[PDB]
Design a protein around this ligand. Structure first.
Ligand SMILES: [Mg+2]
Ligand SMILES: [Mg+2]
Lengths: 123, 124
């Protein structure tokens, strides 16, 4: 019933910051540095929420999502957001939220709080 | 004629830095980690290094140390938004010419790069 969160950010500093802030309120938190690790961690822990970068090494956040969405799963998705092409594809994929960098902590935590309330309602 | 090497693990910031700089400097290289950064330095001997500190494989400071140990003396700009006093201390020992933490101020970056270009000019 706990909200499981997966963070996919290629920047070491930003990834660890996200992880630290989030784990302070949510125990089930995992983080990856590219779309491949991200896809593996997703299959391994089936997180409820995915917070992911778009441009990343090895595999982009959108190709990663497509591979995930193309497996049945329908997690809540927060996108860490320069070209309209990315946005548009992010819509086809079904992205739920777009968070502008520098990531704003309150908005993020507030959004996750919203995601849990929704999870309980359906458990 | 100022050759610049950018080392940053975040793709977005790395590509942004490459774009805004390439607009006014024709010789720019970008690396995603200290190891790749080190290899590119050895290949193209750039005059300027713009590097982050914490990255995969090899960190900016360790990278810088290896490059210096080899005898090169490039101008160095550190773009890390670190959280300790120890990174700063080691950075200064190695000899950094400018700390431009995130979020990066393009204006401050351009002026500094022009200063370096002038130094390489006056020195020919
Ligand atoms: Mg970085
Ligand atoms: Mg990134």
């Amino acid at each position: 019933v706990a909200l499981k969160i997966l963070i996919v950010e290629d920047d070491t500093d930003a990834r660890e910051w996200l992880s630290t802030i989030i784990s302070n309120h949510f125990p089930e938190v995992w983080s990856a540095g590219d779309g491949e690790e991200g896809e593996r961690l997703f299959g391994l822990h089936a997180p409820d929420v995915i917070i992911t970068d778009i441009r990343m090494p090895k595999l982009g956040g959108l190709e990663m999502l497509d591979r995930i969405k193309a497996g049945g799963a329908k997690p809540y998705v927060i996108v860490i957001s320069s070209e309209m092409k990315y946005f548009i594809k992010a819509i086809e994929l079904g992205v739920h939220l777009f968070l502008p960098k520098p990531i704003e902590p309150g908005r993020l935590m507030e959004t996750l709080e919203d995601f849990r309330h929704i999870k309980l309602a359906k458990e």
